């Protein structure tokens, strides 16, 4: 069943589409024949168009508002099978030169959408009185019903699509579905077809880069949601379209926004700043910095030469962690904060300087940039630091100016316990508390790998001994709320499916 | 280019009045940001060109209140309420939202830190190559523009192209494009300009400007003025 969304375009996308995911867009020659049914609604807009096999108009979709057959300014138009159209109110406006179609109803074709049934210019339905209205009410709809309700496996009609998971109480859990069948149109489909991905809610969809991301678990291709902002390959100051930009201007800010990986080399400049008459760019906004914030990778140098004196740390770098050195400045250096007016170095994410050195010099008030061990940060042995001309040690231990004793000697890029690269207790995530919440706390969080993971929310506190081994509702040892057998969950699995989709009472 | 043609030429004004000069752009200075790079660049005979109104209808720093200017679209002016001997000079109506930047005719008003030291005058031949430097201190030299303007007796000025310090990129004019080279020696803090086979309406005043942040050369040098003829 070919599936679908000028005019000769979708004519010719339209020839067959015998099932249209989209909308009949049908807008300004008897190209359509067999377009069954149409999960969305109608935009018929035009004397002669058979449009006889359009039987079903799920209204997924509206022009303004609940419009399912919208039509304006058609007598050999014979919709006869457009006879029940769902979950949508017919908008059928504007039909001056359409014949026999006013002494058919235009009702019965809608179901319990009559408030919105405006209509303005037994019985037949369409043209010709070879054809008739064919009442049916007066879970089949246009007339194992031909069409579903909502979802039409192979001939049965359903309400629902078998689902791809399946609660397992063998296993005690809730596992995968042998028979998972994706809810793809109205059909379920025991693997996803036609090359669409797996979406969230199993309606197989080709576009899901929306608040999403694309991920391949098995050999179908699935959309999983966006964890932060996900992967989006783009240039750089130097490759691309920046291929001559000299800095992130007030031009190519924006372009900037959501780019993850950044293809070519930052070139953070005071020209950026201080805005360039040369290249028609007003000054950069310090506020503008946090589109850079979505940086988690650059595959080149990040050269920083300006900062905004009211910041006194690299905020918009804060997710930067990767400086891959394929592009270097001056050939040596991949981080090139130089004459910064940071108080710290801010990069509390920076974990792998790959090829290039780095050079930290100017920075007249940063102490903590010594501070850091950057044999870790090195992805090669060809690498040496230049940290010099920064705030006096000497200077910054006496002022108090160090980072908290909360840290391991490794290093740290600020005084805030959230900026160090090791921490001597244990770490919760960004930051790192004296200690995991074991036995003291409110997150009662528990320690793996030298990590504070907090437990499953869902497991109440044990003020006696740990408040929970591991992480997951399985491994919490002390639950107030109920257990699913030797196992936490949220309630009791009371509308689940079984073996054909049965209500599992499960126990009490 | 663009022609900037000013509305008054070689205007004299009397000490004490309201001096006006109209300049006018073959296209219209409007540019896709929106902001209309219009600049009057005062020339006091014998000095360097500097800033009046960085804008339209702005002041550049260090310039007196009494420097006015209004204008839109294709049709500029500048105002002088009061006029005093050092308003006395050249007033170029300065175009920089077209790609090549193009100075007015020059309406020779008459009566009716951070410095950049240029070369010294040469005299040379034509064919041959004048390398003209362009010492910058008292600022972060790779981090600014370092424009070759120039301007040939008896006409306005001419944009020649610029030179970034920090990469080296440099935009030749489409009249320079295949004759002059911009370099420069980052480590000593000079920018050079090799104009190779000089030619006998080659001779100039090649002012090494800076570009500053929303107005155009925010600095210039003393100016190397290099006479060729046979």
């Known amino acids: 069943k070919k599936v679908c969304q000028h005019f000769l375009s979708l004519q010719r996308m339209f020839n067959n589409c015998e099932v249209v995911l989209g909308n009949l867009e049908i807008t300004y020659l008897s190209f359509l024949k067999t377009i069954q049914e149409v999960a969305g609604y109608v935009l018929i807009a035009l004397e002669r168009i058979p449009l006889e096999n359009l039987q079903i108009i799920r209204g997924n979709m509206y022009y303004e508002n609940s419009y399912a057959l919208a039509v304006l300014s058609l007598k050999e138009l014979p919709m006869r099978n457009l006879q029940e159209i769902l979950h949508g109110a017919v908008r059928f406006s504007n039909n001056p030169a359409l014949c026999n179609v006013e002494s058919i109803q235009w009702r019965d074709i809608v179901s319990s959408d009559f408030l919105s049934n405006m209509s303005m210019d037994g019985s037949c339905w369409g043209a010709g009185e070879e054809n008739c209205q064919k009442l049916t009410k007066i879970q089949c709809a246009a007339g194992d019903c031909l069409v579903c309700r909502k979802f039409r496996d192979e001939a049965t009609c359903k309400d629902t699509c078998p689902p791809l998971m399946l609660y397992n109480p063998t296993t005690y859990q809730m596992d995968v579905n042998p028979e998972g069948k994706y809810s793809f149109g109205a059909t379920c489909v025991k693997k996803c077809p036609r090359n669409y991905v797996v979406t969230d809610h199993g309606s197989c969809v080709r576009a899901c880069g929306a608040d999403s991301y694309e991920m391949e678990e098995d050999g179908v291709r699935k959309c999983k949601k966006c964890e932060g902002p996900c992967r989006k390959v783009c240039n750089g100051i130097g490759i691309g379209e920046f291929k001559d930009s000299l800095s992130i201007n007030a031009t190519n800010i924006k372009h900037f926004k959501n780019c993850t990986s950044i293809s070519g080399d930052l070139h953070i400049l005071p020209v950026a700043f201080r805005g360039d008459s040369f290249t028609h760019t007003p000054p950069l906004d310090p506020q503008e910095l946090d589109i850079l914030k979505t940086v988690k990778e650059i595959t080149g140098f990040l050269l920083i030469q300006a900062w905004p004196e009211n910041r006194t740390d690299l905020h918009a770098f804060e997710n930067l962690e990767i400086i891959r050195g394929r592009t270097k400045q001056h050939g040596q250096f991949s981080l090139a904060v130089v004459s910064l007016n940071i108080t710290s170095l801010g990069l509390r994410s920076l974990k792998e300087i790959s090829d290039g050195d780095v050079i930290i010099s100017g920075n007249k008030n940063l102490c903590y940039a010594n501070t850091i061990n950057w044999k870790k940060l090195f992805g090669t042995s060809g690498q040496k630091t230049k940290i010099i001309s920064n705030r006096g040690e000497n200077s910054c231990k006496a002022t108090g100016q160090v980072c908290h004793a909360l840290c391991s000697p490794e290093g740290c890029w600020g005084p805030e316990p959230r900026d160090c690269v090791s921490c001597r207790n244990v770490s919760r995530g960004r930051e790192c508390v004296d200690k995991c919440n074991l036995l003291e706390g409110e997150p009662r969080e528990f320690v793996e790998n030298s990590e504070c993971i907090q437990c499953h929310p869902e497991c109440l506190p044990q003020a006696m001994n740990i408040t929970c081994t591991g992480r997951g509702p399985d491994n919490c040892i002390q639950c107030a709320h109920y257990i699913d057998g030797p196992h936490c969950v949220k309630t009791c699995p009371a509308g689940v499916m079984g073996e054909n989709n049965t209500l599992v009472w499960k126990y009490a | 280019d663009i022609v900037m043609t000013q509305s008054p030429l070689s205007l004299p004004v009397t000490p004490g009045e309201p001096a006006s000069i109209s300049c006018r752009s073959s296209?219209?200075?409007?540019?896709?940001?929106?902001?209309?790079?219009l600049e009057w660049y005062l020339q006091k005979p014998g000095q360097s060109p500097q800033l009046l109104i960085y804008?339209?209808?702005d002041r550049f720093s260090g310039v007196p209140d009494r420097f006015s200017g209004s204008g839109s679209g294709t049709d500029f002016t500048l105002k002088i309420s009061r006029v005093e001997a050092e308003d006395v000079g050249v007033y170029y109506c300065?175009?920089?939202?077209?790609?090549?930047?193009?100075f007015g005719q020059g309406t020779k008003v008459e009566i009716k830190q951070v410095q950049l030291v240029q070369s010294g005058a040469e005299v040379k031949k034509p064919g041959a190559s004048v390398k003209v430097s362009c010492k910058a201190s008292?600022?972060?030299?790779?981090?600014?523009?370092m424009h070759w303007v120039r301007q040939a007796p008896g006409q306005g000025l001419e944009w020649m192209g610029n030179?970034?310090?920090?990469?080296?990129?440099?935009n030749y004019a489409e009249k320079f494009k295949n004759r002059v080279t911009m370099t420069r020696d980052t480590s000593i803090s000079t920018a050079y300009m090799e104009l190779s086979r000089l030619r006998s309406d080659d001779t100039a005043v090649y002012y090494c400007?800076?570009?500053?942040?929303?107005?155009?050369?925010?600095?210039w040098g003393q100016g190397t003025l290099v006479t060729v003829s046979s």
């Open positions: 400007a800076r570009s500053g942040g929303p107005y155009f050369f925010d600095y």
């Open positions: 008292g600022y972060t030299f790779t981090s600014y523009w």
């Open positions: 030179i970034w310090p920090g990469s080296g990129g440099t």
């Open positions: 296209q219209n200075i409007v540019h896709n940001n929106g902001i209309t790079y």
């Open positions: 804008k339209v209808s």
């Open positions: 300065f175009q920089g939202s077209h790609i090549p930047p193009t």
